[PDB]
Amino acid sequence: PMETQIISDDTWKLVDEIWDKKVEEIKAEAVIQIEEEKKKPQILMATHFF
């Protein structure tokens, strides 16, 4: 053998980071995605007139 180490140990840290960010984003997206209170028409826009 003659080949020493290759790309890095820090690039593995970066790819672990992006893996964890995507996993956490999926985890957050799965459970807090749907919540609805109301969508009422805003047809008394008083800040234009009153």
Residue 30 Cβ, how far from other proteins at the closest point, in Å?
Answer: 23
Residue 42 Cβ, how far from other proteins at the closest point, in Å?
Answer: 4
Nearer to other proteins, 3 or 37 (CB): 37
Report d(CA 43, CA 46) in Å as an integer.
9
Report d(CA 12, CA 47) in Å as an integer.
54
Sign of CA dihedral 9, 12, 18, 22: negative
Residues that bind other proteins (CB under 8 A): 38-45, 47-50
Residue 46 Cβ, how far from other proteins at the closest point, in Å?
Answer: 9
